[PDB]
């Protein structure tokens, strides 16, 4: 999300009112994003330098998963 096509993907996906899940490497990027898009929960963020993001999406998704992955 922190990056080029990331941020536009969010903004667009949000415009069409969607549950979003983004990955991001920095603790600081968590920051910029959380700011730039207010509609983001802390549930929205998982890591990106690692496989942990899977477990995370599978939790707050009740083991159903996401409808599109970018």
């Amino acid at each position: 999300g922190s990056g080029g096509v990331g941020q536009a993907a969010i903004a667009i996906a949000l415009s069409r009112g969607c549950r979003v899940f983004t990955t991001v490497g920095s603790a600081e990027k968590r920051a910029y994003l959380q700011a730039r898009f207010p509609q983001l929960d802390e549930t929205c963020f998982a890591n990106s330098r690692d496989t942990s993001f899977e477990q995370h999406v599978l939790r707050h998704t009740a083991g159903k998963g996401v409808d599109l992955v970018l």
Partner: protein
């Protein structure tokens, strides 16, 4: 009836394992197992499964056990 068929990622670490283990009053040895079906992961001691997909098998009627019906 369900046999194993795929694992996606097993990860065993016999060091942490020795550690994760304990001793019942029985004098026997055991450790805690946990299953997180929303994440598809079984953990116990030092062995961590991931995506351990099992699957169906046909029960084969052994007709040296057909019942006498009277």
């Amino acid at each position: 009836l369900y046999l194993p068929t795929r694992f996606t990622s097993i990860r065993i670490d016999p060091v942490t394992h020795r550690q994760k283990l304990y001793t019942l009053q029985d004098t026997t040895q055991a450790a805690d197992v946990v299953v997180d079906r929303n994440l598809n992961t079984v953990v116990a001691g030092g062995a961590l499964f991931l995506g351990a997909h099992s699957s169906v098998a046909p029960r084969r009627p052994q007709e040296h056990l057909k019942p006498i019906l009277e």
